[PDB]
């Protein structure tokens, strides 16, 4: 019945906190230090197997502090995420569906040069997906395509739009208490950034690929321990219209990440999770403009995440 289907949902409500510590030693060979805290005051996962529909909502408060020689910048923001997933069971271990995700961020920036500069960001993700699970082999995969559109209005600092596509394929296998998988990812996008008077800051083409093995182990008397290691590369190729010395300049980045996390149920209703991620990204240019002290820009990032969920 339609009326009673409305009440056939489960899911969870939760909260989380994320702390990011970043240091970027740039082409100027000096350190830009950034610390970010993200307070997810509410998230809501909604699962209605009657509709084969899943939904997700999140409300986050974000605070970032940037420090470097002769400059600082603070940014405070609010981020809301709306996610809809309509799935369809195809039988024999196959399923498909469509995800539509909208994420909106509003923030203000404070520095010695601006006082409360406003930024509005809207990101849209549309992801058709295809999943398979073979019960006899205890093996399967997740796969999806994606269209991603990002539009940001930074008022006096102009507008930026990114648009592109990605593809992801993640085969995985379970055996005993183990699960092992490998995520393969490819993304392409265009970047367009302009000043308020139309002056082009950037017009460039981007692509990224990575491979990310994942290993997890589920303990009988408790939770699940997991680790992920990513090796990736990306490149940004500027057209001859980019500004600021970047006309025709290419950027090449090597990416390495390692994650360790643990999730465990607490009684029948609660679940807690903690995760640490290390990231190191090293970038070089095809040619230096002349102001740079070296042809190297290196990010080192440590991220800590903790989450508590109440299931119903
Ligand atoms: O932005 C979309 C989002 O989802 C996509 O995930 C796919 C996934 O590839 C599939 O494997 C499948 O996942 C199903 C189960 O495998 C899975 O266990 C379950 O997830 C539970 C989980 O047990 C629990 O941890 C919790 O999830 C919360 C996470 O702990 C948080 O980290 C946070 O998750 C965010 C991710 O960190 C982001 O990467 C992203 O997730 C993407 C994925 O990359 C992937 O494309 O955004 C997430 C939300 O912001 O929040 C989670 C909820 O609070 O609860 C989960 C739900 O019970 O979920 C699947 C079956 O229900 O299906 C996915 C398609 O939706
Ligand atoms: O306070 C200003 C700024 O100071 C510090 O920036 C350093 C930077 O770390 C160094 O790498 C170097 O910057 C180089 C760039 O690497 C090089 O690409 C080019 O930059 C041009 C941009 O590529 C072009 O887009 C445009 O920049 C825009 C920018 O896209 C807008 O977002 C907006 O930038 C603002 C920043 O968002 C804000 O954080 C702050 O910037 C700090 C920075 O955080 C800090 O690390 O202020 C700016 C507004 O001033 O506006 C700009 C301007 O249109 O233009 C640039 C310039 O051609 O060239 C620069 C300079 O060689 O040096 C800077 C300064 O030391
Ligand atoms: C195999 O053929 C089926 C292809 O999948 C159909 C795509 O549309 C499915 C929509 O599911 C939501 C109901
Ligand atoms: C509402 C946004 C629609 C934009 C068009 C997306 C078209 C992408 O489809 C490409 C192929 O996808 C394979 C099957 O996708 C599953 C469709 O079922 C969705 C049920 O609503
Ligand atoms: C739910 C949408 C209404 O909330 C508006 C208030 O949100 C404050 C700013 O949050 C950032 C997202 O803004 C987009 C609002 O849809
Ligand atoms: C519904 C449609 C979903 C189909 C998804 C198929 O895409 C796979 C090494 O890194 C290279 C990137 O690997 C390619 C990723 O697919
Ligand atoms: C990977 C596509 C799904 C088909 C697998 C069915 C089992 C066939 O394996 C036999 C070897
Ligand atoms: C990746 C999909 C694996 O599951 C499909 C069934 O595969 C049978 C095993 O074939 C040898 C690997
Ligand atoms: C706006 C509606 C868009 C919905 C359709 O997008 C579904 C995902 O696609 C990989 O996909 C093709 C890559 O194209 C490469 C050159 O454009
Ligand atoms: C089974 C019960 C205990 C067996 C071992 C499980 O505990 C593993 C603990 O490791 C958790 C570390 O995860 C990252 C913690 O850092 C996150 C920062 O908040």
Q: What is the 3-state secondary structure (H, E, C) of 158-205?
A: CEEEEEEEEEEEEEEEEECCEEEEEEEEEEEEEEEEECCCCCEEEEEE
Q: Which residues pair with 213 in a beta bridge?
A: 182
Protein residue whose Cα sits closest to atom 5 of ligand 9: 147
Protein residue whose Cα sits closest to atom 57 of ligand 1: 45
Closest among 208, 193, 204 to 253, alpha carbons compared: 208
Say if residues 77 and 104 touch (Cβ distance below 8 Å): no
Residue 237 CA to ligand 2 center (angstroms) comes to: 18
Instruction: State CA 146 to chain mean position distance.
Output: 13
Protein residue whose Cα sits closest to atom 2 of ligand 3: 90
Residue 165 CA to ligand 6 center (angstroms) comes to: 11
CB-based burial, 115-135: b 16+ in 10 Å, e otherwise: eebebebebebebebebbbee
Residues with CB under 6 A from ligand 8: 134, 137, 139-141, 171
- Phi and psi of 4, rounded to 5°? -80, -20
Residue whose token pair is 């090796």: 231
Residue 11 CA to ligand 1 center (angstroms) comes to: 12
Protein residue whose Cα sits closest to atom 2 of ligand 6: 129
Q: Which long-range contacts (CB under 8 A, 24 or more apart) does 288-291 make?
A: 288/27, 289/245, 289/246, 289/249, 290/245, 291/28, 291/245
> Which one of 21, 272, 276 would you pick to mutate in the ligand 10 pocket, going by the greatest count of ligand atoms within 8 A of its CB?
276
DSSP string across the chain: -HHHHTT--EEEEEEEEEEEEEEEE-TTS-EEEEEEEEEEEEEEEEEETTTTEEEEEEEEEEEEEEEETTEEEEEEEEEEEEEEEEEEEEETTEEEEEEEEEEEEEEEEE-SS-EEEEEEEEEEEEEEEEEEEETTTTEEEEEEEEEEEEEEE-GGG-EEEEEEEEEEEEEEEEETTEEEEEEEEEEEEEEEEE-TTS-EEEEEEEEEEEEEEEEEEE-TTS-EEEEEEEEEEEEEEE-TT--TT-TT-EEEEEEEEEEEEEEEEETTTEEEEEEEEEEEEEEEESS--SS-S-S-EEEEEEEEEEEEEEE-
Q: Does residue 145's CB lie within 6 angstroms of at least one atom of ligand 9?
A: yes
Q: Does residue 145's CB lie within 6 angstroms of at least one atom of ligand 6?
A: yes
Say if residues 210 and 232 touch (Cβ distance below 8 Å): yes
Closest among 43, 3, 31 to 305, alpha carbons compared: 43
Q: CA-CA distance, 158 to 5, in Å (whole number)?
A: 47
Protein residue whose Cα sits closest to atom 9 of ligand 7: 137
Longest Cα–Cα distance in the chain: 70
Please give the structure tokens belonging to residue 72.
């600082």
Say if residues 183 and 208 touch (Cβ distance below 8 Å): no
Q: Does residue 43's CB lie within 6 angstroms of at least one atom of ligand 1?
A: yes
Say if residues 230 and 244 touch (Cβ distance below 8 Å): no
Q: CA-CA distance, 158 to 155, in Å (whole number)?
A: 5
Q: CA-CA distance, 243 to 124, in Å (whole number)?
A: 27
Q: Which residues pair with 127 in a beta bridge?
A: 99
Protein residue whose Cα sits closest to atom 14 of ligand 9: 165
Residues with CB under 6 A from ligand 4: 86, 96-98, 100, 126, 128
Residue 96 CA to ligand 4 center (angstroms) comes to: 10
Q: How far is CA 57 from CA 43, 79, 95, in A?
A: 5, 11, 23
Residue 34 CA to ligand 4 center (angstroms) comes to: 39
Residue 140 CA to ligand 7 center (angstroms) comes to: 9
What technique determined this structure?
A: X-ray
Residue whose token pair is 């400059």: 71
Please give the structure tokens belonging to residue 132.
């398979």
Q: CA-CA distance, 302 to 257, in Å (whole number)?
A: 10
What residues contact residue 72 under an 8 Å CB cut-off, 6+ apart? 65, 66, 111, 112
Q: Does residue 273's CB lie within 6 angstroms of at least one atom of ligand 1?
A: yes
Pairing of the two strands 53-68 and 71-91 = antiparallel
Give the chain's radius of gyration (CA, Å): 22
Q: CA-CA distance, 28 to 83, in Å (whole number)?
A: 40
Q: Does residue 41's CB lie within 6 angstroms of at least one atom of ligand 10?
A: no
Looking at the CA of 90, name the nearest ligand: 3
Instruction: State CA 110 to chain mean position distance.
Output: 25
Say if residues 139 and 171 touch (Cβ distance below 8 Å): yes
Closest among 68, 65, 66 to 26, alpha carbons compared: 68
């Amino acid at each position: 019945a339609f009326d009673e289907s409305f009440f056939s949902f489960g899911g969870h409500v939760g909260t989380s906190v994320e702390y990011e510590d970043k240091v970027t030693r740039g082409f100027n060979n000096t350190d830009k230090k950034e610390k970010t805290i993200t307070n997810e005051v509410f998230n809501f996962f909604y699962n209605n197997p009657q509709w084969n529909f899943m939904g997700f909502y999140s409300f986050k408060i974000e605070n970032r502090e940037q420090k470097e020689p002769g400059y600082y910048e603070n940014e405070d923001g609010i981020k809301q995420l709306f996610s809809l997933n309509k799935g369809h069971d195809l039988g024999n271990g196959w399923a498909t569906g469509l995800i539509y995700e909208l994420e909106y961020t509003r923030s203000k920036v404070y520095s010695p040069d601006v006082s409360g500069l406003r930024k509005n960001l809207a990101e849209h993700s549309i992801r058709p997906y295809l999943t398979y699970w073979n019960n006899d082999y205890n093996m399967g995969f997740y796969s999806n395509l994606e269209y991603l559109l990002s539009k940001e209005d930074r008022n006096a600092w102009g507008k930026r739009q990114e648009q592109g596509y990605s593809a992801l394929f993640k085969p995985y296998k379970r055996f005993g208490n183990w699960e092992v998988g490998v995520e393969f990812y490819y993304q392409i996008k265009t970047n367009d950034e302009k000043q308020p008077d139309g002056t082009i800051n950037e017009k460039s083409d981007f692509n990224e690929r990575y491979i990310e093995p994942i290993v997890q182990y589920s303990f009988d008397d408790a939770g699940t321990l997991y680790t992920r290691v990513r090796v990736g590369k990306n490149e940004t190729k500027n057209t001859d219209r980019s500004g600021g010395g970047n006309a025709g300049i290419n950027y090449f980045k090597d990416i390495r990440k390692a994650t360790v996390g643990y999730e465990q149920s607490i009684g029948e209703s609660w679940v807690a999770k903690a995760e640490y991620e290390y990231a190191n990204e090293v970038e070089k240019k095809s040619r230096l403009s002349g102001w740079e002290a070296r042809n190297k820009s290196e990010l080192t990032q440590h991220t800590f995440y903790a989450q508590a969920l109440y299931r119903f």
